[PDB]
């Protein structure tokens, strides 16, 4: 009995920082329904610190939230000269908040959950053949007590496409909802 709090791939313009750089909302329209994703791939510069933040998510009655990510990561050997500037992980954070801060973003309020690493990187020959390796990772966070929360994703120089962000809680039939 799961209750869904956020489902990016079911929805079809999240905050990004710094302005004008980094994560970008993308689509693949090779089939009748579009596939959306947040992508970043600034693998050559070596000084990247790109943040993607969900909108405010109502927590409902969840004490613990479960977070499922689906994503691709390109092999850093795809990028000639990227040995030291390219990474193959990204970082996952959260913040709790009673208030929807809107366009205001303060990194200092966020707590790291984990490094997110791919079980499978997508090598160049597979990318060009349109064969990507979709990874799935799950984490959970709590106890939570504020009205809502945010997730954020920090890129430090990897080539990542984030296709799915699902957040749910369990046993919502033991709670009274407002």
């Amino acid at each position: 009995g799961e209750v869904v709090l956020l489902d990016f791939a079911a929805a079809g313009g999240w905050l990004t920082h710094p302005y004008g750089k980094g994560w970008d909302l993308m689509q693949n329209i090779m089939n009748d329904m579009p596939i959306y994703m947040y992508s970043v791939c600034n693998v050559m510069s070596g000084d990247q610190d790109n943040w993607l933040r969900t909108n405010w998510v109502y927590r409902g009655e969840a004490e613990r939230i479960f977070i499922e990510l689906k994503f691709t990561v390109r092999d850093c050997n795809s990028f000639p000269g990227g040995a030291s500037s390219c990474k193959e992980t990204f970082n996952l954070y959260y913040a709790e908040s009673d208030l929807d801060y809107g366009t205001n973003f303060q990194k200092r309020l966020f707590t790291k959950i984990d490094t997110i690493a791919p079980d499978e990187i997508t090598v160049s020959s597979d990318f060009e053949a349109r064969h990507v390796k979709l990874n799935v990772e799950e984490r959970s966070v709590g106890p939570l007590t504020r009205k809502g929360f945010y997730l954020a994703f920090q890129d430090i120089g990897a080539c990542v496409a984030l296709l799915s962000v699902r957040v749910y809680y369990k046993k919502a039939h033991h709670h009274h909802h407002h």
Partner: peptide, 11 residues
């Protein structure tokens, strides 16, 4: 740039 996902364009 490089693209993270094949055949993807900004939305």
């Amino acid at each position: 740039x490089w693209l993270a996902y094949p055949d993807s364009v900004p939305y």
